[PDB]
Coordinates of C-alpha atoms and ligand atoms in Angstrom, one line a residue:
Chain A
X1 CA 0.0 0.0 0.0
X2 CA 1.8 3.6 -1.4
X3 CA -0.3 5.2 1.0
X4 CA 0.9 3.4 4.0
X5 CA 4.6 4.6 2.9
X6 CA 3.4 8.0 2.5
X7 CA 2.1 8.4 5.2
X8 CA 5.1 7.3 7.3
X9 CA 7.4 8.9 5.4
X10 CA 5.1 12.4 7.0
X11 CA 6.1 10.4 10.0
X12 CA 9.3 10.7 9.7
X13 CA 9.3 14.2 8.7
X14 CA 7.4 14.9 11.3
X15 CA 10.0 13.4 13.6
X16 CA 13.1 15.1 11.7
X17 CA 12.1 18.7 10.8
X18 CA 15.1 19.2 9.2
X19 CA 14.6 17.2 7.0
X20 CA 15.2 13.5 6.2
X21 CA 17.5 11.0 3.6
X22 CA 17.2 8.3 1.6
X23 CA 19.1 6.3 3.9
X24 CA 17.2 7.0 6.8
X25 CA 14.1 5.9 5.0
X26 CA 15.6 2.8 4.0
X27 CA 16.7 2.1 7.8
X28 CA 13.8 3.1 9.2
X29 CA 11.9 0.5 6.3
X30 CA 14.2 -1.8 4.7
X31 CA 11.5 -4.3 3.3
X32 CA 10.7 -1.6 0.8
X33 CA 12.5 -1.7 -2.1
X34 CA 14.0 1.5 -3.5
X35 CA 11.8 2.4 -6.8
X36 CA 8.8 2.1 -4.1
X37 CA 10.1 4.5 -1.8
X38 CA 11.1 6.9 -5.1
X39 CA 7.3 6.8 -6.6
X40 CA 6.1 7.7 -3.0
X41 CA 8.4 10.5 -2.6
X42 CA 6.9 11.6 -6.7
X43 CA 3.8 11.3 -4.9
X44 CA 4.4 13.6 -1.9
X45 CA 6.2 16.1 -3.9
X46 CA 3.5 16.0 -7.0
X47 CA 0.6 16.8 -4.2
X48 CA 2.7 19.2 -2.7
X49 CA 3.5 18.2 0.9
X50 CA 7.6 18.1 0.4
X51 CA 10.4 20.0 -0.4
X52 CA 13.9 19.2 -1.9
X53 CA 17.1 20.4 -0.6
X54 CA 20.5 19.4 -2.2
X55 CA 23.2 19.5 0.5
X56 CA 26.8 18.4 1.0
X57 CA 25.3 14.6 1.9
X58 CA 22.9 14.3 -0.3
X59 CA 19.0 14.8 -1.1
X60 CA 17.1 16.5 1.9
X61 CA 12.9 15.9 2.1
X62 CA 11.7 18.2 4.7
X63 CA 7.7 18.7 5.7
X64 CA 6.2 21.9 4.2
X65 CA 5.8 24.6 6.7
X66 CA 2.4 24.4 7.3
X67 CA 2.1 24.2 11.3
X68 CA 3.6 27.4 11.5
X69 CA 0.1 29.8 10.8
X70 CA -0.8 33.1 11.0
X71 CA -3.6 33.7 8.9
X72 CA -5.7 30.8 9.1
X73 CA -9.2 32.9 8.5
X74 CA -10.1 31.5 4.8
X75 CA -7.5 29.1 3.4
X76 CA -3.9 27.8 4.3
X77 CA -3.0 27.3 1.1
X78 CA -2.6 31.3 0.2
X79 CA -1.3 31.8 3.4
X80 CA 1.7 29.9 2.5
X81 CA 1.8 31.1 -0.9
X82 CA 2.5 34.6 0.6
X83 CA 4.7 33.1 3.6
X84 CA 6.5 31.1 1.4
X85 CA 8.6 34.2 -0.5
X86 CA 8.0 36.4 2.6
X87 CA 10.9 33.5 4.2
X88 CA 13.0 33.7 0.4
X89 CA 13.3 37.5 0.8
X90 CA 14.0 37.0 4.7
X91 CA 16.5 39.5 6.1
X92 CA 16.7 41.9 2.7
X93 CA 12.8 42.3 3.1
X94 CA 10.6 42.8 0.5
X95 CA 7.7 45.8 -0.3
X96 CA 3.9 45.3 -0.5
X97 CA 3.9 46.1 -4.0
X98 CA 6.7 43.1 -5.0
X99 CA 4.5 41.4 -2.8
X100 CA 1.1 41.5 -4.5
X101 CA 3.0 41.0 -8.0
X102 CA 4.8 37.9 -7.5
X103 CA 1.3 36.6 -5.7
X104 CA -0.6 38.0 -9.1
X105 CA -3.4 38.6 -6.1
X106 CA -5.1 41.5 -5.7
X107 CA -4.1 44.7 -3.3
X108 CA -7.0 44.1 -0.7
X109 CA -6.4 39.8 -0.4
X110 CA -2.6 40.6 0.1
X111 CA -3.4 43.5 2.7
X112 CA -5.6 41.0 4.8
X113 CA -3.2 38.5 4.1
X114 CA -0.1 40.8 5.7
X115 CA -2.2 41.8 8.6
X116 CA -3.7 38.6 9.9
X117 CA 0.2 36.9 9.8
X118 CA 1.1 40.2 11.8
X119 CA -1.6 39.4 14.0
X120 CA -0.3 36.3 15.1
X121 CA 3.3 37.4 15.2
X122 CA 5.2 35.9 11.9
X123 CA 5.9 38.9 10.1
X124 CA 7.5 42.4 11.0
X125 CA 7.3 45.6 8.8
X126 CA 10.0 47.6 8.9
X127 CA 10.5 51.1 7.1
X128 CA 12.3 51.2 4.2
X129 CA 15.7 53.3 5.0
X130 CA 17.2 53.4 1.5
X131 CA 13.9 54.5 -0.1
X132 CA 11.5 55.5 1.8
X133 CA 8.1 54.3 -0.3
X134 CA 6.3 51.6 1.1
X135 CA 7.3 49.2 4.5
X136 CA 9.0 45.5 4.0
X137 CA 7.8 42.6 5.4
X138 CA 10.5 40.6 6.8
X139 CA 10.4 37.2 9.1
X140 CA 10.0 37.9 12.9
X141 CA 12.7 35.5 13.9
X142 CA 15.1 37.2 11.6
X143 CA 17.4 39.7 12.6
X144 CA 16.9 42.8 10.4
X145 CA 19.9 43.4 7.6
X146 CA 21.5 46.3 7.9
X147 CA 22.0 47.5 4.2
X148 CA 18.0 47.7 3.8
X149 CA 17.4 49.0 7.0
X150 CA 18.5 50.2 10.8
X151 CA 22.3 51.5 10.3
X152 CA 24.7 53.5 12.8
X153 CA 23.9 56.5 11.4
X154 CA 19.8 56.5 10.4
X155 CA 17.6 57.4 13.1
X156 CA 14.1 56.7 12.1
X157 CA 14.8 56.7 8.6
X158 CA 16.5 60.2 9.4
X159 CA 19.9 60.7 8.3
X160 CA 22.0 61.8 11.0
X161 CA 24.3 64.7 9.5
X162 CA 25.5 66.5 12.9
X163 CA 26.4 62.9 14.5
X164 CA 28.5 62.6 11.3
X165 CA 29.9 66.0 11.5
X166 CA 31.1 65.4 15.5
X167 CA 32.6 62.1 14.6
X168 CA 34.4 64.0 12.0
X169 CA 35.6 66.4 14.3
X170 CA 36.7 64.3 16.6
X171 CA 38.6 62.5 14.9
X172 CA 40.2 64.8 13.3
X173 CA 41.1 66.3 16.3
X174 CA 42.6 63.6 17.9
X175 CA 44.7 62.2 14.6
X176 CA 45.5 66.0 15.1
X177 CA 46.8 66.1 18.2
X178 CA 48.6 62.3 18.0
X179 CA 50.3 64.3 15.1
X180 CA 51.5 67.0 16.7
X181 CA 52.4 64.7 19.7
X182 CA 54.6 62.5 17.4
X183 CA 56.3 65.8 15.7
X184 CA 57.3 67.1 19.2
X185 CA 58.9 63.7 20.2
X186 CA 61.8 64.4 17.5
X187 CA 63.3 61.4 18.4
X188 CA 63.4 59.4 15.3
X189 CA 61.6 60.2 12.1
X190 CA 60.7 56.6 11.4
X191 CA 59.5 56.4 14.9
X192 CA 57.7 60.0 14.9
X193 CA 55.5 58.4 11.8
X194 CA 55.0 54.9 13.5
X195 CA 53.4 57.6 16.3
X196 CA 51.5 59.3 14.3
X197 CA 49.9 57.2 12.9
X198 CA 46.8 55.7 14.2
X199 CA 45.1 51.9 13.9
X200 CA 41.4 52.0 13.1
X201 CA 41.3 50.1 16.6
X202 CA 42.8 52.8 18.9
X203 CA 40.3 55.7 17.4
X204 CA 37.6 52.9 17.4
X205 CA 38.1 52.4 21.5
X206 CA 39.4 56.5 21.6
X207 CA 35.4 56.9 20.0
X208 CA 33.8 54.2 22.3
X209 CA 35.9 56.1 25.4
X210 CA 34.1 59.5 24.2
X211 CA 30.3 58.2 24.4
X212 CA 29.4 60.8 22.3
X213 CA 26.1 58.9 20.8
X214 CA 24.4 55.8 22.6
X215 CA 24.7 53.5 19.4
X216 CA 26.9 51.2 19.4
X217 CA 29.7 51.8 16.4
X218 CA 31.6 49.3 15.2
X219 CA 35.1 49.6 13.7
X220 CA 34.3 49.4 10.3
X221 CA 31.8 52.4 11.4
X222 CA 35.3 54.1 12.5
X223 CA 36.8 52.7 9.4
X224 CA 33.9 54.2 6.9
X225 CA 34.7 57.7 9.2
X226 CA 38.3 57.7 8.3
X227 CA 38.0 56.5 4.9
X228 CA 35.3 59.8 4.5
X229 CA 37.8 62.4 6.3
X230 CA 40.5 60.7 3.6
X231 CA 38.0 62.1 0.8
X232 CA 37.8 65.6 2.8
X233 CA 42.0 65.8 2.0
X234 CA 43.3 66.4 5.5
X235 CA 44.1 62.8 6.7
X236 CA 46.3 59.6 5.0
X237 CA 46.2 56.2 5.1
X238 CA 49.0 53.7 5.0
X239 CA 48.1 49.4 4.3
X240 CA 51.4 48.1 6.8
X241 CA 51.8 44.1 7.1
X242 CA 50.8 42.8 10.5
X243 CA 49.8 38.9 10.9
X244 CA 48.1 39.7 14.1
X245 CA 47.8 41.7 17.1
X246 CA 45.9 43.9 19.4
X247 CA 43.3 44.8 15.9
X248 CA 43.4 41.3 14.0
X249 CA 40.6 42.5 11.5
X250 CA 42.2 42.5 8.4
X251 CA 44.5 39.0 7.4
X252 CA 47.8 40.0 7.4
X253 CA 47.2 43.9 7.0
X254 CA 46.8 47.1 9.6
X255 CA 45.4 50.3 8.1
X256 CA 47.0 53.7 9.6
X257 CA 46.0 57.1 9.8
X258 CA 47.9 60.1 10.2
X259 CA 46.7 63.8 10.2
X260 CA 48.5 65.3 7.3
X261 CA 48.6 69.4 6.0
X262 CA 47.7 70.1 2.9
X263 CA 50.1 70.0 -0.3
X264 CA 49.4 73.7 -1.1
X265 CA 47.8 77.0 0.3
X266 CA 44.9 77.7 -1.5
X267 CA 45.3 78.6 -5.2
X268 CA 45.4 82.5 -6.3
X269 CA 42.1 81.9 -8.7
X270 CA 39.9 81.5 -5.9
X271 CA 41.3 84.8 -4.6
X272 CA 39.6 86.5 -7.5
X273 CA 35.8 86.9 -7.9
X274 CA 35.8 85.9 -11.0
X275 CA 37.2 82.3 -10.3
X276 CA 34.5 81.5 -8.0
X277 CA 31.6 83.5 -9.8
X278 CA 28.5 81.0 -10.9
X279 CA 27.6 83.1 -13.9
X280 CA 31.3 83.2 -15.2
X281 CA 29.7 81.9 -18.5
X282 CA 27.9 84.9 -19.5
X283 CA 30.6 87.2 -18.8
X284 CA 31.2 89.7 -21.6
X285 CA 32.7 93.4 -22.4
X286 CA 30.1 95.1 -23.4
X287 CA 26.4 93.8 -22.2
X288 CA 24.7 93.4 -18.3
X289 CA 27.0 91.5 -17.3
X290 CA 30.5 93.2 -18.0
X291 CA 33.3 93.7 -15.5
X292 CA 33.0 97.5 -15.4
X293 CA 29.9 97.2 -13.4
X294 CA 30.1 93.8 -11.5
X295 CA 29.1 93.7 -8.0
X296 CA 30.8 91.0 -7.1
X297 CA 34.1 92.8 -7.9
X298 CA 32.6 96.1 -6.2
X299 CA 32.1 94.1 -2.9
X300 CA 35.0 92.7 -2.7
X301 CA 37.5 96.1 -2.9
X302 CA 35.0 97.4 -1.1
X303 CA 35.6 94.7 1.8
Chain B
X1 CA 29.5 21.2 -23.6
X2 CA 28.5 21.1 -19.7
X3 CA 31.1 18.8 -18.8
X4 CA 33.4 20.2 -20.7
X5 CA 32.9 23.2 -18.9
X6 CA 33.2 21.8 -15.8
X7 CA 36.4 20.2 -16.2
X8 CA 38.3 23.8 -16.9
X9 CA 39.8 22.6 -13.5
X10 CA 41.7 19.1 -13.3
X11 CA 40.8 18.7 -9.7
X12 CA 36.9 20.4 -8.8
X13 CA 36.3 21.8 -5.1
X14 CA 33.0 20.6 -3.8
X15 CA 30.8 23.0 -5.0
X16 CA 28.8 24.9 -2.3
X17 CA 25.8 25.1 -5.1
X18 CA 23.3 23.7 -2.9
X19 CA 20.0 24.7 -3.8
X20 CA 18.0 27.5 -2.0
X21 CA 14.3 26.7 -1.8
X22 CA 13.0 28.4 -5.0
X23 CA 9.5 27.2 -4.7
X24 CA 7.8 29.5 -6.6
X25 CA 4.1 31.1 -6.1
X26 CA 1.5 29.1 -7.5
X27 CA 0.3 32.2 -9.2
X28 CA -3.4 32.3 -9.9
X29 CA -3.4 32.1 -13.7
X30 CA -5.4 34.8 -15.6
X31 CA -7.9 33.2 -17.6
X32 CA -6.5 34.3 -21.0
X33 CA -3.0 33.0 -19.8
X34 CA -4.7 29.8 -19.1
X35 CA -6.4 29.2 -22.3
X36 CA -2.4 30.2 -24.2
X37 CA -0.9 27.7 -21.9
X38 CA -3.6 25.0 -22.9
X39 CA -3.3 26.0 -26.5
X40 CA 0.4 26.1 -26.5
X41 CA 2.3 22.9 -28.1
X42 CA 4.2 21.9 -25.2
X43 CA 0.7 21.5 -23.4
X44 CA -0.8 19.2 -25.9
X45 CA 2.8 17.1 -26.3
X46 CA 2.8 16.7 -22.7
X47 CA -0.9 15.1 -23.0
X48 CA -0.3 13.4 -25.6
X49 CA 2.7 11.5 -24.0
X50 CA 0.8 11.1 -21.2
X51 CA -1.0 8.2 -23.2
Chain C
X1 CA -29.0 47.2 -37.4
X2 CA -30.6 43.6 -36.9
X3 CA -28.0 41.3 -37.4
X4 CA -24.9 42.6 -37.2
X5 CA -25.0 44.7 -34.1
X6 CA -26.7 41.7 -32.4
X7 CA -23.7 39.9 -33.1
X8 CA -21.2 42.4 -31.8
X9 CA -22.6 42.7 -28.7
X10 CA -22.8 38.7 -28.6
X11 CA -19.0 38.5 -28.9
X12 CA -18.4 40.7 -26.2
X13 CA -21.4 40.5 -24.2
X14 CA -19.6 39.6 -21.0
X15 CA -17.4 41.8 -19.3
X16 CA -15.5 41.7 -15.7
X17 CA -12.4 43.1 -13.9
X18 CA -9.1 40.9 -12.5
X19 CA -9.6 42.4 -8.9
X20 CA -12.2 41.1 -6.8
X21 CA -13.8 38.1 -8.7
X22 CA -17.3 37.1 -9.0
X23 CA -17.8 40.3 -10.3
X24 CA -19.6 40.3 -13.7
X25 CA -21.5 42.5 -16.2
X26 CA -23.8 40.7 -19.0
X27 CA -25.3 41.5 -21.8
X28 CA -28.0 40.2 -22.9
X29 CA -30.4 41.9 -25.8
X30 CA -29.6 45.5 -27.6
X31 CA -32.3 47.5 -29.3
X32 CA -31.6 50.5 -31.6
X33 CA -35.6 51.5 -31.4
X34 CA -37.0 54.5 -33.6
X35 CA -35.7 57.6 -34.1
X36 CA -36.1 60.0 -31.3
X37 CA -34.8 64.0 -29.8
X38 CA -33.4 64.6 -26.3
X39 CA -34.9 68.3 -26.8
X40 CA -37.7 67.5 -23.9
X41 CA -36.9 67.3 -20.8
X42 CA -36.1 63.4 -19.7
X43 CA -38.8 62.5 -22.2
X44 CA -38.0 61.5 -25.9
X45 CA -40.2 62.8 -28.8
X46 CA -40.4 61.6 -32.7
X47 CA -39.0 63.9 -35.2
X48 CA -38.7 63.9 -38.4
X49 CA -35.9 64.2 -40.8
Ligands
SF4_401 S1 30.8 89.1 -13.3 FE1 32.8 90.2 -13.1 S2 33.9 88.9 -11.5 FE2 32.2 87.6 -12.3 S3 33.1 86.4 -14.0 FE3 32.2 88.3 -15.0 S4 33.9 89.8 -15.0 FE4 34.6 88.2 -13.6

């Protein structure tokens, strides 16, 4: 009798919800030849109750979630059907409107759908932080990503610019003053550059020591920091071999920074109004807009 | 072809290719969809293999 | 007038939306009638060519 198999093979799947062998199968009943136990598992998988997974040992066949339930008012069958990619998206979330297209269901089934499973506590919306348009639905038991949403520096889907702007500061300041530390040493230049610079460990803990926010910042936060202040032109970084030590994140490397000048003052062009005039274009002798009667020129002798 | 590809290596790591549960929605098929799925060829091969 | 448009209407004489199912509209008869003017109010009136 096939159905006799099938139904202990849901036995078994019941018992393993990880999901069970071929071998196990066999052990468990070895009077059953193999093509049996292969048309039964067609069966299962034809009508829907098993899933497939290929992993390092072998062939998997796991149950199909159907215990877990939210929305159990009408049918379990589309509840699934919308749980089943909710899971597949997972941690990078997915919005309503992906949602009701790869369910081809309309907006109101998909709406009751959403809020009876975040009734019974299987799904969590969470507000977009890269685009701010509609909320993803993500699993509850997952721990939200945080490229799609959450970050160090969002707040509520808020960018934070002065939290930036302080970090900014203070590091500076303190690659700054390890700088100017390490050039009134004068003891050895090789060792008054070791000094200055500065692992993206130390200004991690320096950071953490400060408190200045109550998120926690990580040191690729500290990293990200440094690697922005690079881009402003006032600090340098240096890769240096190091297998491991008091930093260990990188596999044989150690980033430093150092506070560095400038290469040169600012250039004369800028200390014209004319280089930093934004209708430089329609400049001409003789017209409205002619040197003779500029008022950007007139304010500045007249400053 | 396909084997051929795979042997550009002499020696092949164990792939970590295992399969990621892709079960797609069971979209509820518009009728006109339906009816160019019935009346496509692949549809009426199928059934007639099924015999 | 008497065939044709009969016909017409036949071939697309039902009509319904993707979103919320088991919603329908059906045709069932069309009727051209005799010539008429909208000149009155809500009431129709013969008239001649
Ligand atoms: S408006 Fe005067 S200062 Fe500005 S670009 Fe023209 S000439 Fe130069």
């Amino acid at each position: 009798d096939p159905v006799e198999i099938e139904n202990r093979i849901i036995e078994l799947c019941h018992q393993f919800p990880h999901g069970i062998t071929d071998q196990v199968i066999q052990n468990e009943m070895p009077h059953i030849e193999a093509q049996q136990r292969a048309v039964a598992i067609n069966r299962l998988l034809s009508m829907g109750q098993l899933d497939l997974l290929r992993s390092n040992t072998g062939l998997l066949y796991r149950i199909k979630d159907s215990q877990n339930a939210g929305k159990m008012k009408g049918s379990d069958n589309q509840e699934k059907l919308v749980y089943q990619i909710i899971e597949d998206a997972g941690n990078k979330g997915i919005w309503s409107r992906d949602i009701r297209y790869k369910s081809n269901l309309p907006l109101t089934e998909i709406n009751k759908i959403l809020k009876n499973l975040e009734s019974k506590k299987l799904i969590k919306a969470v507000k977009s932080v890269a685009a701010s348009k509609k909320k993803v639905y993500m699993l509850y038991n997952l721990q939200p990503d945080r490229s799609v949403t959450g970050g160090a520096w969002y707040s509520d889907q808020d960018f934070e610019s002065e939290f930036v702007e302080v970090l900014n500061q203070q590091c500076f300041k303190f690659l700054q003053s390890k700088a100017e530390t390490a050039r009134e040493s004068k003891q050895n230049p090789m060792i008054q550059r070791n000094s200055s610079f500065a692992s993206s460990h130390e200004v991690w803990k320096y950071i953490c020591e400060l408190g200045i926010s109550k998120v926690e910042l990580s040191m690729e936060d500290i990293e990200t920091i440094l690697n922005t202040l690079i881009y402003d032109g006032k600090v340098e970084m240096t890769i240096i071999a190091a297998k491991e030590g008091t930093v260990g994140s990188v596999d044989g490397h150690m980033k430093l920074y150092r506070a560095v000048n400038p290469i040169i003052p600012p250039t004369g062009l800028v200390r014209a109004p004319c280089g930093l005039c934004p209708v430089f274009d329609d400049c001409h002798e003789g017209g409205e807009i002619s040197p003779s009667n500029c008022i950007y020129m007139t304010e500045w002798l007249e400053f | 072809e396909a084997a051929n590809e795979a042997g550009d290596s002499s020696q092949d790591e164990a792939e970590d290719d295992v399969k990621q549960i892709t079960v797609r929605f069971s979209r509820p098929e518009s009728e006109q969809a339906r009816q160019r799925r019935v009346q496509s060829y692949e549809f009426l091969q199928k059934k007639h293999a099924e015999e | 007038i008497n065939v044709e448009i009969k016909k017409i209407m036949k071939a697309n004489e039902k009509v319904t939306s993707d979103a919320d199912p088991m919603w329908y509209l059906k045709y069932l008869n069309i009727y051209v009638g005799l010539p008429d003017v909208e000149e009155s109010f809500n009431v129709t009136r013969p008239v001649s060519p």
